[PDB]
Amino acid sequence: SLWVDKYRPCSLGRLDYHKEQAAQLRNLVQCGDFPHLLVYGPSGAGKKTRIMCILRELYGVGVEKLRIEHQTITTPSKKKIEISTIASNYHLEVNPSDAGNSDRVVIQEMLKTVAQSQQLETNSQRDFKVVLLTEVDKLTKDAQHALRRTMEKYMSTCRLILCCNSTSKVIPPIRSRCLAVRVPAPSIEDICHVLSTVCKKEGLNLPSQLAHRLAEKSCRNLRKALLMCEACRVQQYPFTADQEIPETDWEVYLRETANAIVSQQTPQRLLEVRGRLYELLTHCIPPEIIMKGLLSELLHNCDGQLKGEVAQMAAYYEHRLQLGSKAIYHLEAFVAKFMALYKKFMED
Amino acid sequence: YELPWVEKYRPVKLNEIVGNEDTVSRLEVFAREGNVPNIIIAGPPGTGKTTSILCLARALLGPALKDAMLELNASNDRGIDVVRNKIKMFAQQKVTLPKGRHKIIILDEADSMTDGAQQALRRTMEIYSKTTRFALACNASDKIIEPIQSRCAVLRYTKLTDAQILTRLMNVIEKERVPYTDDGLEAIIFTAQGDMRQALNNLQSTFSGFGFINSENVFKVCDEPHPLLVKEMIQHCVNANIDEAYKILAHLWHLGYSPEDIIGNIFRVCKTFQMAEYLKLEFIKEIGYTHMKIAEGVNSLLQMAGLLARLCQKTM
Amino acid sequence: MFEARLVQGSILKKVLEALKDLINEACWDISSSGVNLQSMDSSHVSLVQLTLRSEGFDTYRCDRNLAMGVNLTSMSKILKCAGNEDIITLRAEDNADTLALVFEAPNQEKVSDYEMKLMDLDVEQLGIPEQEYSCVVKMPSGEFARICRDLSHIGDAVVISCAKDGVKFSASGELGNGNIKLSQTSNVDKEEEAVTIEMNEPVQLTFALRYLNFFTKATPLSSTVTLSMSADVPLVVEYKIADMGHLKYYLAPKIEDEEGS
Amino acid sequence: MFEARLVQGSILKKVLEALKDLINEACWDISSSGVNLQSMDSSHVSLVQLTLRSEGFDTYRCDRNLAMGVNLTSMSKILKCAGNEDIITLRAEDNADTLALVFEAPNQEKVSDYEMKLMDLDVEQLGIPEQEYSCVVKMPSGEFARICRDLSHIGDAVVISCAKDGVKFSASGELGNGNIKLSQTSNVDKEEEAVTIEMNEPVQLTFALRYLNFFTKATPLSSTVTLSMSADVPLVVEYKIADMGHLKYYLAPKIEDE
Amino acid sequence: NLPWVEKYRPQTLNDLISHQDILSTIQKFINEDRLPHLLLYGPPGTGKTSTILACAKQLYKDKEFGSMVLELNASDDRGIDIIRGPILSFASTRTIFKKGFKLVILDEADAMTQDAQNALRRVIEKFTENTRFCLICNYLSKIIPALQSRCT
Amino acid sequence: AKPVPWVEKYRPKCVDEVAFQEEVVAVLKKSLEGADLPNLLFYGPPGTGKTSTILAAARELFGPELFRLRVLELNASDERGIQVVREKVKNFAQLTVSGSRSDGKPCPPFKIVILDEADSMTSAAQAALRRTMEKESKTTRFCLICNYVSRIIEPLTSRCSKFRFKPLSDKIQQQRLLDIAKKENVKISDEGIAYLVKVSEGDLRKAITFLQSATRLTGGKEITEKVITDIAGVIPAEKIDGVFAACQSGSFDKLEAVVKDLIDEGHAATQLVNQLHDVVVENNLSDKQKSIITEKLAEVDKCLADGADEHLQLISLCATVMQQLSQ
Numbered sequence A: 001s002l003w004v005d006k007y008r009p010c011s012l013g014r015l016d017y018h019k020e021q022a023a024q025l026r027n028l029v030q031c032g033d034f035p036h037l038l039v040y041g042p043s044g045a046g047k048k049t050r051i052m053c054i055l056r057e058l059y060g061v062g063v064e065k066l067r068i069e070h071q072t073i074t075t076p077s078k079k080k081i082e083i084s085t086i087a088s089n090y091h092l093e094v095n096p097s098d099a100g101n102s103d104r105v106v107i108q109e110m111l112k113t114v115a116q117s118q119q120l121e122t123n124s125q126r127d128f129k130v131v132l133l134t135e136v137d138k139l140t141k142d143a144q145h146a147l148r149r150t151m152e153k154y155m156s157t158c159r160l161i162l163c164c165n166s167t168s169k170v171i172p173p174i175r176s177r178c179l180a181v182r183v184p185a186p187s188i189e190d191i192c193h194v195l196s197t198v199c200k201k202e203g204l205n206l207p208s209q210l211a212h213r214l215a216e217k218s219c220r221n222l223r224k225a226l227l228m229c230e231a232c233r234v235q236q237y238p239f240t241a242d243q244e245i246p247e248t249d250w251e252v253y254l255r256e257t258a259n260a261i262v263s264q265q266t267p268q269r270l271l272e273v274r275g276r277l278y279e280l281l282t283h284c285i286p287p288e289i290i291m292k293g294l295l296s297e298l299l300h301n302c303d304g305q306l307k308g309e310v311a312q313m314a315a316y317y318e319h320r321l322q323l324g325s326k327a328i329y330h331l332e333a334f335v336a337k338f339m340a341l342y343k344k345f346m347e348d
Numbered sequence B: 001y002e003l004p005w006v007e008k009y010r011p012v013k014l015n016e017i018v019g020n021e022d023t024v025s026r027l028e029v030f031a032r033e034g035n036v037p038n039i040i041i042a043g044p045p046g047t048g049k050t051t052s053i054l055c056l057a058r059a060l061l062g063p064a065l066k067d068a069m070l071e072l073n074a075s076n077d078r079g080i081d082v083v084r085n086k087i088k089m090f091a092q093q094k095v096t097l098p099k100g101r102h103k104i105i106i107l108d109e110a111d112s113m114t115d116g117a118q119q120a121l122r123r124t125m126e127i128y129s130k131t132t133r134f135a136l137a138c139n140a141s142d143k144i145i146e147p148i149q150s151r152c153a154v155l156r157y158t159k160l161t162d163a164q165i166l167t168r169l170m171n172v173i174e175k176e177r178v179p180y181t182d183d184g185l186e187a188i189i190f191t192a193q194g195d196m197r198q199a200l201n202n203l204q205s206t207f208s209g210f211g212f213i214n215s216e217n218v219f220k221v222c223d224e225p226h227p228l229l230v231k232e233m234i235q236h237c238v239n240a241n242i243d244e245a246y247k248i249l250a251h252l253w254h255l256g257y258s259p260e261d262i263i264g265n266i267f268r269v270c271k272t273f274q275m276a277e278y279l280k281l282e283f284i285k286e287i288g289y290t291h292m293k294i295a296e297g298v299n300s301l302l303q304m305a306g307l308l309a310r311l312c313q314k315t316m
Numbered sequence C: 001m002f003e004a005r006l007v008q009g010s011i012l013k014k015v016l017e018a019l020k021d022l023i024n025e026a027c028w029d030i031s032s033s034g035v036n037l038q039s040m041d042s043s044h045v046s047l048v049q050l051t052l053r054s055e056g057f058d059t060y061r062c063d064r065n066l067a068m069g070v071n072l073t074s075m076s077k078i079l080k081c082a083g084n085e086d087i088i089t090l091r092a093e094d095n096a097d098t099l100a101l102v103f104e105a106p107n108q109e110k111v112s113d114y115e116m117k118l119m120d121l122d123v124e125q126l127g128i129p130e131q132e133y134s135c136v137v138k139m140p141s142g143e144f145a146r147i148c149r150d151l152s153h154i155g156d157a158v159v160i161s162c163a164k165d166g167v168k169f170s171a172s173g174e175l176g177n178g179n180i181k182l183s184q185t186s187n188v189d190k191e192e193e194a195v196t197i198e199m200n201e202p203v204q205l206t207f208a209l210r211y212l213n214f215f216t217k218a219t220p221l222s223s224t225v226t227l228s229m230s231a232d233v234p235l236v237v238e239y240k241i242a243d244m245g246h247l248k249y250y251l252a253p254k255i256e257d258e259e260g261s
Numbered sequence D: 001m002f003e004a005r006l007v008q009g010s011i012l013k014k015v016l017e018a019l020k021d022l023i024n025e026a027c028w029d030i031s032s033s034g035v036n037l038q039s040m041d042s043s044h045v046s047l048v049q050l051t052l053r054s055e056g057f058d059t060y061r062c063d064r065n066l067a068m069g070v071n072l073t074s075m076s077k078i079l080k081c082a083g084n085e086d087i088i089t090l091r092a093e094d095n096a097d098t099l100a101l102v103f104e105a106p107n108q109e110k111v112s113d114y115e116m117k118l119m120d121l122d123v124e125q126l127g128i129p130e131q132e133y134s135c136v137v138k139m140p141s142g143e144f145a146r147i148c149r150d151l152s153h154i155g156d157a158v159v160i161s162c163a164k165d166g167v168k169f170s171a172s173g174e175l176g177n178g179n180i181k182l183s184q185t186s187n188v189d190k191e192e193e194a195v196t197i198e199m200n201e202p203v204q205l206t207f208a209l210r211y212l213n214f215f216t217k218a219t220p221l222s223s224t225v226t227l228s229m230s231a232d233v234p235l236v237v238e239y240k241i242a243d244m245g246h247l248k249y250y251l252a253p254k255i256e257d258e
Numbered sequence E: 001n002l003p004w005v006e007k008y009r010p011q012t013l014n015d016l017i018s019h020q021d022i023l024s025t026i027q028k029f030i031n032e033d034r035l036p037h038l039l040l041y042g043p044p045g046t047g048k049t050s051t052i053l054a055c056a057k058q059l060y061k062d063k064e065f066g067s068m069v070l071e072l073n074a075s076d077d078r079g080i081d082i083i084r085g086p087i088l089s090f091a092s093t094r095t096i097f098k099k100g101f102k103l104v105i106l107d108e109a110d111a112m113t114q115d116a117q118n119a120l121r122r123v124i125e126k127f128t129e130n131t132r133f134c135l136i137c138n139y140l141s142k143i144i145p146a147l148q149s150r151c152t
Numbered sequence F: 001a002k003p004v005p006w007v008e009k010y011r012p013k014c015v016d017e018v019a020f021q022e023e024v025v026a027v028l029k030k031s032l033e034g035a036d037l038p039n040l041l042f043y044g045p046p047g048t049g050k051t052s053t054i055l056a057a058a059r060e061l062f063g064p065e066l067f068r069l070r071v072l073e074l075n076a077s078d079e080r081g082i083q084v085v086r087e088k089v090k091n092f093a094q095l096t097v098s099g100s101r102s103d104g105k106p107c108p109p110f111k112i113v114i115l116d117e118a119d120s121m122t123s124a125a126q127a128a129l130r131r132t133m134e135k136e137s138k139t140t141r142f143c144l145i146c147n148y149v150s151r152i153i154e155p156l157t158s159r160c161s162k163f164r165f166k167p168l169s170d171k172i173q174q175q176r177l178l179d180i181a182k183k184e185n186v187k188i189s190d191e192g193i194a195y196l197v198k199v200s201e202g203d204l205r206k207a208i209t210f211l212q213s214a215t216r217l218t219g220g221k222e223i224t225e226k227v228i229t230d231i232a233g234v235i236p237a238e239k240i241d242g243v244f245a246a247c248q249s250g251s252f253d254k255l256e257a258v259v260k261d262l263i264d265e266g267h268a269a270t271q272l273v274n275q276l277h278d279v280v281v282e283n284n285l286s287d288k289q290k291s292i293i294t295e296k297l298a299e300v301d302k303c304l305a306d307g308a309d310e311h312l313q314l315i316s317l318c319a320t321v322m323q324q325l326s327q
């Protein structure tokens, strides 16, 4: 069993970072009229830790007894779509963004179905029940309009906890009626604290300097930090400060992509780097993640008078990739513009 | 109760069609021979796909046309039961036909049919091909699946070159003795844009509307933005002049023109304008971007002003 | 004050089942001569005129004319509350939003009060002129209903031709042809089963079969149907509703293109 | 060991389409008194009590108290194999997982044996109290099905009111209102066509019409139905299946206020 | 009383103004019986329905208006169903009274899909001598070029 | 009883309870004697009480006997479907009663339908609403409630009477929130109340919901600035001073540090655009610097409205405020 999820907290008092938000949420769920929640922050900050912790504090013992159900829905076109559901006897958890263009269909039908379902022995447990919408940000406009309709009509019997990142694409009038809970990414010292705790439980003597290296290469992402710690334990048990940390294959692939860019400024190297971009894109990783990795591994090389225009073109081609439908044209346009600007930079 | 000119001057034989000369000649070779393969005819509207398929079916069958030819169309219902029943038991039927002549199912506007309709189509046209042959008509081949274009012979009809449109127009005009001016007839070409039925209807319409066929009468009964005004607009955008082009913009906006038609005529004039090739490419890209601004729902005069500003700044 | 009593009760039900799917809203024009109705379909192809005379009602009295908007689906449900032998009394006010129908048992044991809310409609009274017809054919109701019910399986249209041999109903569809002939019958023991044809000029017209199938749900109203057909004249389908009135239909014929082949 | 033979088998078929739509699975409870069905609908509104008495059967053997929970849609499917005149045999042992259905011809030229799979159900027996109902109206079940069917077209519920002028049914909806009224009939030729009102206190109550339409599929069983009402209690509707037994349906009145 | 927009819908070809060329061409079409199918396009509120309704009331009396004019728009459901419903059923049949062509008035005609436009343009070709369509639209550019190649 | 939120609980109820909106009372008071009115459209920030004003207004025009029979109230964001626009309004206008009351008072014979929060509808739904207003212009009158003007389309606003609803602008909300705090026994100082007014631009309902949320988190503790800054979606001011200190002079390493230190905190980039815009338009920068920074803030908010990545765009925005601040 991995220690990333084995030593996960259960109660709100055994949290390692953001104690004040933990106390605020504990006193919020201590009284009645628990409102609609919109939890947000960066990836790996620990939103879902707060969410199952809130579910632990809201209910009794049976909060981690989860199972997968499969529910079929019908589009206006005659086609059956099977959707997945992570559910318990006290709550619901749905990812509704897996259905791309039929997100309004599932957002109407599935929560109409669970709203029309009656809580058996409702006097014993609590007043209402909670529904998690795990990936909610990339839902489209009228899907989120049906979502706020669902929030309005079953306000007495079904409150929702929407979890996402980058709420700019989340519509305004769902943010008005939802209590906004913001979970920041843990700092370098809090990541070092929880790494030292997860090593002290498992009989380990991690030096502080290697914990700083793990925190600074995890880029404020605790799950990735604990996975690096696990992989470092697998690689070598005697821990030295000068330790080779096993970085993930797509980051070092982006590093090789970036040094293939800065090596040559010719169309043949552009063909090679377009092949590398295709190999990166075929693994179903998001192109904004590729863009961010390219800019992070690109700013370690370029001169100080050229970082600003490079960053502006990075934002420009990420935005036009979001407006478009095929990623490789905008990505290789960004790479071609960077090569043209760099060869103008060293040519003069 | 006189018939309109679109149906009165429809061709009755396959050599009166001026659309695609090699395809028409091969269709006549198949009409005199008999073993016509499964064909699909694609192209823009007005090229004469319907009259080519109808003339091929007539010259094949002759007196047995009323029983050996099934014309299914867009105004009829084309559900799953229709391709299950009507097309199937037409393809299963027997007609006493000659040695080379074959049954014909004229499927006009096949791009508008549903996917299950084509799913029930495919087996039928592969199996019953010893007796019935499918002559599909369509506008865009993208809405039709690739297997139907595979089992058919695809016949791309081009947009008509203006010379054959002129020859048919002198044929109709000499058949009616309608007076004309030359530049008015070129205005009828400009209003046609590869749509020959549109040219005939606009000429028809215009003569019934106002005697002499002159640029003023056809441009009055059509009321598109004038080519001279939009061409002078693009010329004023070439030499980096926002103001002189904006009097033409205010002239075309106080005349009550919708922005969609303004940007469509802007692109259509910019297609054939005599300017630098890379400059024409940049102009077409900016006109396309403003056309997405229009199509997304921003139809202000300021979008035209910003289009003029972007065309002005792209010429230094 | 609109009180109108009708003893034979299911005849209004058959009148309504004739209007059941052919029309969804209609206006009742009420005068001292009685009840009038003139409406069209939503497609504006078929015209329906319904006339119920004053003397056919049991106790009819009506002080002022009434234009009354009716949804025939609502009283299609309400007249299904009426029995076959029940007595129907219709009651309305001069400025009513309401309509009252009282269903009474023949032994005066069961009494029923039913209310319908009325809707406003714009009325276009299309004055039908009196025209002499080239052909007038009276035939059984069940026979004509069977004629359209068989010929609606073959095709969607019928070609009806009246000539010196008689009347011919033809159909041509994807299954094949169909031609049913009827001749003038000299002697029947009953007057309700004979086909009797009066003529000036032989006619031939094509009609949609959905409309005729909607028309011939008025079969139990009358035992005999009068089809008045002529060139440039619609197909008049007259049912004589006993001695209390008449139900008349008007179908425009279809366009037949002329082909030399 | 439980065997039952009944000479008129269409009455159990009429029982079957009386409750194959209301309730999906039912527990049959047989003791030496006979057969009882106290079942409870899925939407938590209606109660059904069907009882069949011992003396009406041709022959009857029952050893122990037994409770078999059978799906009535499937056993409605198996009784559709039987005719309207055939004598019916039901057989089940003390630990029966099966139900044997034998349909025999009156002239004994056709004897049919079929098997039914049985399932276990957790059954709660609701104690129906013996109480004095204020109002009892006896009327024709064909007219009662006619009442439910012609009032169901108007609205979703009926407010029915009984008083010294008789009984009264009222429905309201977007089409309008319906208001039927019955009085005490004095002279009849047949007692099944009469209307009899036993009165204690005039009462008004509102009930949903879907369940009334469901209850009016028992009207070929009895020529008369009995509608019994009082204050703050479930409505009783009652069919007398011959001298064989009875069919009571308990309806929860609608108390929703705006 | 009513708002002033509905009280003064020009009922006569005399009351309306600033559309004199459309007036002259349409009356010239309708007096000599050379009226084609019409497609009236422009901005909202410039009187598209008023002129065609006054022309249809100029042609026919009030006692025959119900069988010679069918009015539809987008308040009803519009698509592939109602083109195969009321429209061609009105268009393919004759007149219940007298003789002459018919009229279908379709307000806000730019709101239908191009499949419905293809069905309607084939309906326009099939029945022309007995039916004269009138399509009122806001934007011309929402209409397929073959439909603009049918109706003036 | 159920815990009622204090927005609809504390809304006005009568015609004259509207807190100085006497023009909206007076126009109708004229319409009572005139017995005729066109379509209406009330636009304004929420919590003002447009819905309650039109409910009491229709109660004055019809009475409590005719209120449940002649007034149909629908929420447009609850009825965004094109079917329920084109069916329920048609059914309401088709079912007609007379315009005569049992009290003997005169009454105008047209119906009343209300569509609340109609600005959230799309273009096609609003076009279908325009069609429903077009065909039902004789027997049913239309009134709409919205918060913004241009979200309602031009054909929908060309057939209605537009009424601006002004809220309690200044110096009334602070003591009102003090009465709510003293009624529910809530301890909150003056600066917290002033910050509650300041975080919502003219919005009462936002302030009541933020006070409800802060009292729910504290549960009886002091409402400090940190809790209100957390709930109201405010970046703390020291983060903006750190951003301006990093972008004033130095290298791109400190910007990347503060941008990656602003995304990590969980802050929305649109909130940075709003607050950075607020601190640029009020500071003592040059006009060219203020102009370039604010134009880029508008472009960044555009692309964040289009769903672009916040990280790269905050990098580019901080890069151009660095190139404008260092020069």
Ligand SMILES: Nc1ncnc2c1ncn2[C@@H]1O[C@H](COP(=O)(O)OP(=O)(O)OP(O)(O)=S)[C@@H](O)[C@H]1O
Pocket: B005, B006, B007, B009, B010, B011, B016, B017, B018, B019, B044, B045, B046, B047, B048, B049, B050, B051, B052, B138, B139, B168, B196, B197, B200, E146
């Ligand atoms: N090549 C041609 N030569 C002569 N007349 C033509 C030609 N093409 C079209 N026409 C005329 O235009 C009319 C319409 O032609 P159609 O074949 O119906 O157009 P189409 O190819 O079917 O395109 P659609 O159906 O509108 S997409 C015919 O009746 C002819 O009078």
Ligand SMILES: Nc1ncnc2c1ncn2[C@@H]1O[C@H](COP(=O)(O)OP(=O)(O)OP(O)(O)=S)[C@@H](O)[C@H]1O
Pocket: E005, E006, E008, E009, E010, E015, E016, E017, E018, E019, E043, E044, E045, E046, E047, E048, E049, E050, E051, E108, E137, E138
């Ligand atoms: N030329 C005109 N002269 C006089 N009144 C006019 C004129 N044009 C419009 N009107 C008035 O405008 C009112 C509305 O006209 P409509 O024909 O209904 O508008 P429209 O052209 O159909 O645009 P729509 O229906 O919104 S697409 C009419 O009732 C007239 O009172």
Ligand SMILES: Nc1ncnc2c1ncn2[C@@H]1O[C@H](COP(=O)(O)OP(=O)(O)O)[C@@H](O)[C@H]1O
Pocket: A004, A005, A007, A008, A009, A014, A015, A016, A017, A042, A043, A044, A045, A046, A047, A048, A049, A050, A194, A222, A223
């Ligand atoms: N106090 C803590 N102790 C141990 N692990 C923690 C703690 N807080 C966060 N984590 C770890 O950080 C990871 C954050 O993942 P998750 O909750 O999914 O965040 P996100 O939803 O943003 O990806 C979790 O896997 C969890 O194990």
Ligand SMILES: [Mg+2]
Pocket: B049, B050, B108, B109, B137
């Ligand atoms: Mg074609």
Ligand SMILES: [Mg+2]
Pocket: E048, E049, E107
């Ligand atoms: Mg109009």
